[PDB]
Amino acid sequence: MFTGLVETTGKILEIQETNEGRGFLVETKWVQPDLKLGDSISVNGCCQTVTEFTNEGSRFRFYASFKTLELTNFKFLKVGEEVNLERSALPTTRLGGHLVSGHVDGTGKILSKEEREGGAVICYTVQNDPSLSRYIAPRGSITVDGISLTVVDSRPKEFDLVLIPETLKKTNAKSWNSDTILNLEIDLVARYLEQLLKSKE
Amino acid sequence: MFTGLVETTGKILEIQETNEGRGFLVETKWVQPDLKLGDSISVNGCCQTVTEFTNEGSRFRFYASFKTLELTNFKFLKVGEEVNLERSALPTTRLGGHLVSGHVDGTGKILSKEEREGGAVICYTVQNDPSLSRYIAPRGSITVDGISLTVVDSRPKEFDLVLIPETLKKTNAKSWNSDTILNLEIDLVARYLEQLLKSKE
Amino acid sequence: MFTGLVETTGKILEIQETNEGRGFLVETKWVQPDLKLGDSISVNGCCQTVTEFTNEGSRFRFYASFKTLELTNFKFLKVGEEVNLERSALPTTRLGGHLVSGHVDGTGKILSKEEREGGAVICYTVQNDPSLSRYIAPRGSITVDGISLTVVDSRPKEFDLVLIPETLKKTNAKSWNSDTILNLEIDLVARYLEQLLKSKE
């Protein structure tokens, strides 16, 4: 369970191919580093489980199945690459952010960029499998490389985003260009709503 | 209040039957054992209250009402069963599962088992009361014997699961077979959403 | 925060009218008092701050605004009334109820009591402003006079509760009858979910 509000980023240091997937070592500076062997982390919007930590979390390793490699943008991660981090949410009477599973529903490539109001707002357009189009509502939410964002408009086969760079500098969004590929988690809320309707007949 | 993230398991040592229902003695190794008389614990997804503890919880007793016997799989617990444990969350508890009440909604029988990728994923199908079908969204969450899980697909009156072996070995799931009954808690989120719609129309 | 798990109760000893509201003196013996000038406390589900303490904690005073008098059942408190107490959580407090702000949303009148299965379950029905109906989901949570409880069934007018006598003896619920006024804190979760929905409209 996550809010899709990225705490910080980390640098991929190391990658071991193995007979059942890829083995990532990552470095970062957490606020109040609490990492425990086992606890969950949304790496670019993708929940991964901690198999080791090397400095009460300052470094930590996780392991991605061949499947998580085909499901997500993880296939393309290179040593050194900056990555979005969010630990599972804590109990708090102040609930903020969105409802984020950290379960990638497929991927999307950047089609267009634009800088309206002279670099106050960045206008991305992103390709989506049309099976997802149903879950992607204008003025609705979505979680892109683990960054919770509001869809501005959606078409079949694409949708539009706008960002304040008060997100772009504090995340991996800095290095979004060309088509450089994004993990998409559609709004769970939508999935649940849809299910309540189906079950009425 | 729980996150459906199993801390450890414990061995049922002993079973009484009394004016306060059948009486379970359990042994386990907690990290930082904090057990107080009256604290809550989700025993295979079922909140139970501590009536006694030794060595601050290394062993502890609780009592299940004849009602919680009718509500849950507790009738089928045998001495020496390993069972799934989770203490109520702390303010410093990563909510690595989702929102879990520890209030069993219903039970479910395993219909099918299957070992894809040579036994690297176990593929369960599980029967549910159709009252619940509407709360069980594909790619949505659910709490099975207190284990927070993502539903893979759902039908009216059944749903599909897949387990990474790390989950199977770390929980009671290893011993899930045809004759197993499972405690089912549907996502609170769904129940709340449903209520906002009923009253918003 | 709080978890809507009542530690103990106290007896109102004294009530001073003041230029600001009513001034309550309360007594109790609770385990390991670290009660400090300033700490927060949910008095029948209502966060109040301690302005004084006597005899190493045994007694403590707090002050309720005319607003908290109109908002809550505090208007009805008489000298010698038993009151539900819960200290704000520490990092080592187990959250045995749910997520509780201690910020009263409304009050509710008891309509019906009933003692089914020979007095082993008490069946309360409670009137709520229909403003709240949408937050009150069957099999959902709620905080009634600071007691965390699961709603059994809910209508737009009313909702149903069921209680163990163990709860009634250990809280102020003993003194719930037809026409008792109760402090209602609806589940935050619902309020937050409602916000995710409204943003998609």
Residue among C91, C189, C197 minimizing CB distance to B91: C91
Report whether A36 contacts A177 (CB < 8 A): no
Chain A residues near residue C196 by CB distance under 8 angstroms: 98-99, 141, 187, 189
Closest-CA residue of chain A to B195: A196
Those residues with Cβ within 8 angstroms of residue C158's Cβ, 6 or more apart along the chain or in another chain: C111, C125, C126, C127, C128
CB pairs under 8 A between A and C: 33
Helix (H) or strand (E) holding B67, with range, is: helix B66-71
Give the distance from residue B141's alpha carbon to the nearest chain C alpha carbon, in angstroms.
16
Method used to solve the structure: X-ray
Helices (H), chain C: 66-71, 130-133, 165-170, 188-198
Q: Which of A92, A93, A139 sits opposite C199 (nearest CB)?
A: A139
Partners of B12 in the β-ladder: B26
**Residues of C in Cβ contact (< 8 Å) with B191:** 137-140
In the block, tokens 């979004």 appear at: A176
Chain C residues lying within 8 Å of A93, measured CB to CB? 1, 99-101, 188
Q: Residues A61, A63, A68, A74: is their CA dihedral positive or negative?
A: positive
Residue pair C101/C47 in contact (Cβ under 8 Å)? The answer is yes
The DSSP line for chain A is -B-S---EEEEEEEEEEETTEEEEEEE---SS----TT-EEEETTEEEEEEEESSTTSEEEEEEEHHHHHHSGGGG--TT-EEEEEEPPPP-SS--S--B------EE-EEE--EETTTTEEEEEEE--HHHHTT--TT-EEEETTEEEE-SEEETTEEEEEE-HHHHTTSGGGG--TT--EEEEE-HHHHHHHHHHHTT-
DSSP, collapsed to helix, strand or coil, labels residue C70 as: helix
Option in C188, C196, C197 nearest A93 (CB): C188
Tell me the shortest Cα–Cα distance from A139 to chain C, in angstroms: 6
Nearest CB partner across the interface for C196, out of A91, A92, A99: A99
- Read off the amino acid at residue B3: T
Closest CA to B46 of B29, B32, B65: B65
